[PDB]
């Protein structure tokens, strides 16, 4: 084992660390106050801000007493400095200020008895990590502070998984990506506490590897002197465990080069950082890039190739009312007022579902868009699905949409299995799984928003709607509102659409200037507020809706006498009308459902289909 002479002495660095902890100020010293809080059992996590270390270094330099570069040393080799700082804190932990129940703690009693036994033996200990009740983390060097003092911050500079190469091992770096998998928290053993069934003593073993070999024979002085063979046994009550969690971080789409596939990197989280990462978040993880040596035979076989991981140390997470809301739903298309109004009604989904007689009327308004290719169906779906909090976008996922609107594109193509699944959902509002491996039943009170094309690919006026639609007639009937959007050539409308699209392509902004769209956040919060509300209905409104129902049934029967009618009205239509009225009242924020809401709902159902069919 030859030796080298590196230009680093850990004694001056340790002295600098102690001076920084005891003297630095930014009241009393910041880190001494934090240690005071740690001693009183209030705090259990000490975060070292490299910005503070840089500031302390520059203050010392200004005073003229230049010292060693602590920040660069920490960044270049960070594993050693965790232990160095922990030792420094252990040396300077202040006495507690608030009395605590020492006897309640198992470790206090055990160590007191160990002290008593050692005193008795003398009249004729335990690793430092065992008594530690805090975790130490490094906060990277912020970009602004590095620029303020004319320095380069490697730690806070973001990297992709691709840029993290084999020469970065052992440093303090940052990674940018989206988390794809987070494991469950579990106990990782740091110090193991044994007991002797003969000597009555306790042994401690330190573990800093994936595996270890437990002790089986007493090593106490009494056992060796007496030669008594007392077996050692584990005790989980006295050991020390640290919360452990393993995550995975993947490259962002914009970071992968051309004609390549994304890569992923493991992350280890220990201490109080657990549960700070979940799948789907875009984060800037700061950690120590270390290898993971194999053990035993696997080490011999594996050769010199090494697995790697990141020890998480800091995580940064990234971020007239009706007409206004409708026009603001999607400003990049040409206005479809009726469709947008119906979609908003779907989004709010107001309903009073408390029958309590065995089952209740469905508490979701379902909307279907059917139109010849060319109209903005996919754009409407994408917008309505982004706005919603629970929106789930799929192509012909349901679990994610539970208690929310479901965004199904290409509904007609869908396979019979999914058609049966949705048929079950609408009727029963339940997800049922019957498998030998698992049997889990989940409720699903979720709304469906579908988009489909006619049978022949375009609407044929000669054939009636029913024949144009491939889906079962029962499924169409179950829909609360069915919208049929058609693409009719016309000089004026075509010119307007062309001007709109072309302005959008040239300038990258909305062309309209007559009105200003409402901010999306305001619309979302108002929608949530409306969902929170609950309206009510009287007897007079009940009579009015009943009269409307008989009128609609007579008209629908007369229409069904011919083949043009989509389908004769049914009690489902009455339930849908009252559901729409309730949602409209929710938007109005009034308990008492006005006749105006019912009239507007009637107009909406009429214009859903007849307005365009009669054209």
């Amino acid at each position: 084992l030859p030796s080298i002479q590196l230009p680093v002495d850990y004694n001056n660095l340790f002295n600098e660390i102690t001076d920084f902890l005891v003297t630095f100020k930014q009241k009393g010293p910041k880190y001494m106050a934090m240690l005071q809080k740690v001693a009183n059992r209030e705090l259990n996590s000490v975060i070292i801000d490299l910005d503070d270390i840089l500031q302390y270094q520059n203050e010392k330099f200004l005073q003229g007493t230049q010292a060693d570069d602590l920040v660069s040393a920490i960044q270049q080799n960070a594993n050693h400095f965790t232990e160095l700082f922990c030792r420094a804190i252990d040396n300077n932990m202040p006495l507690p200020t608030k009395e605590i129940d020492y006897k309640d703690d198992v470790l206090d009693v055990i160590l007191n008895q160990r002290r008593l036994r050692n005193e008795r033996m003398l009249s004729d200990l335990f690793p430092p990590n065992l008594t530690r009740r805090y975790f130490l983390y490094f906060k990277p060097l912020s970009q602004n502070c590095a620029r303020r003092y004319r320095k380069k911050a490697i730690s806070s500079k973001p990297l992709s998984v691709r840029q993290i190469k084999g020469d970065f091992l052992g440093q303090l770096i940052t990674v940018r990506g989206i988390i794809t998998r987070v494991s469950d928290v579990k106990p990782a053993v740091e110090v193991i506490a044994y007991t002797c069934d003969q000597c009555g003593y306790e042994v401690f073993q330190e573990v800093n590897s994936r595996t270890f070999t437990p002790l089986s024979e007493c090593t106490s002085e009494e056992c060796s002197q007496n030669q008594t063979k007392g077996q050692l046994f584990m005790s989980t009550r006295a050991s020390k465990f640290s919360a452990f969690q393993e995550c995975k971080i993947q490259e962002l789409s914009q970071q992968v080069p051309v004609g390549h596939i994304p890569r992923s990197l493991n992350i280890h989280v220990n201490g109080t950082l657990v549960r700070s990462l979940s799948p789907g978040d875009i984060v800037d993880v700061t950690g120590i890039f270390l290898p993971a040596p194999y053990t035993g035979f696997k080490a011999l076989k594996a050769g010199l190739l090494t697995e790697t991981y990141l020890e998480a140390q800091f995580v940064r997470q990234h971020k007239d009312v009706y007409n206004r809301l409708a026009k603001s739903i999607a400003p990049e298309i040409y206005g479809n007022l009726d469709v947008k109004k119906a979609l908003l009604l779907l989004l709010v989904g107001g309903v009073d579902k408390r029958v309590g007689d065995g089952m209740k009327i469905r508490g979701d308004i379902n909307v279907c868009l059917m139109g010849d290719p060319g109209v903005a169906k996919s754009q409407l779906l994408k917008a309505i699905c982004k706005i919603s909090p629970r929106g789930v976008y799929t192509t012909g996922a349901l679990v994610l949409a539970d208690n929310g609107i479901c965004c199904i594109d290409e509904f007609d193509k869908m396979d019979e299995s999914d058609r049966t699944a949705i048929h079950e959902v609408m009727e029963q509002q339940t997800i049922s799984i019957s498998k030998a491996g698992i049997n889990t039943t989940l409720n699903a009170r979720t709304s469906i928003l579908a988009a489909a094309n006619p049978l022949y690919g375009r609407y044929n006026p000669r054939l009636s709607p029913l024949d144009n639609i491939n889906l079962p007639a029962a499924l169409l009937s179950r829909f609360d509102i069915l919208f049929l959007m058609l693409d009719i050539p016309s000089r004026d409308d075509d010119e307007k659409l062309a001007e709109h699209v072309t302005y959008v392509h040239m300038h990258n902004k909305q062309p309209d200037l007559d009105f200003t769209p409402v901010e999306p956040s305001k619309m979302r919060e108002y929608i949530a507020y409306a969902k929170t509300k609950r309206p009510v209905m009287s007897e007079a409104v009940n009579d009015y809706v009943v009269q409307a129902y008989i009128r609609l049934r007579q008209d629908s029967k007369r229409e069904m006498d011919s083949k043009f009618s989509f389908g004769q009205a049914t009690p489902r239509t009455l339930l849908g009308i009252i559901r729409l009225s309730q949602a409209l009242a929710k938007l109005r924020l009034a308990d008492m459902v006005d006749i105006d809401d019912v009239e507007e709902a009637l107009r909406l159902v009429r214009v859903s289909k007849e307005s365009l069919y009669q054209e």
């Binding site: 008895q113 008593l116 036994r117 007991t195 002797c196 069934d197 003969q198 009555g200 009550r237």
Partner: protein, 43 residues
């Protein structure tokens, strides 16, 4: 022991002098003759 073998009850018996020995078993947790018998048998 009424409970299963892995229940995991640990004991600390005090000798006439201030030293504590460790015994395992619910019967030991209850009784002292059983504790001494186990101490002898575990040798």
């Amino acid at each position: 022991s009424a409970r299963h073998s892995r229940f995991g009850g640990l004991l600390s018996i005090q000798t006439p002098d201030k030293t504590r020995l460790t015994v395992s078993g619910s019967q030991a947790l209850v009784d002292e003759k059983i504790a001494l018998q186990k101490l002898d048998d575990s040798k």
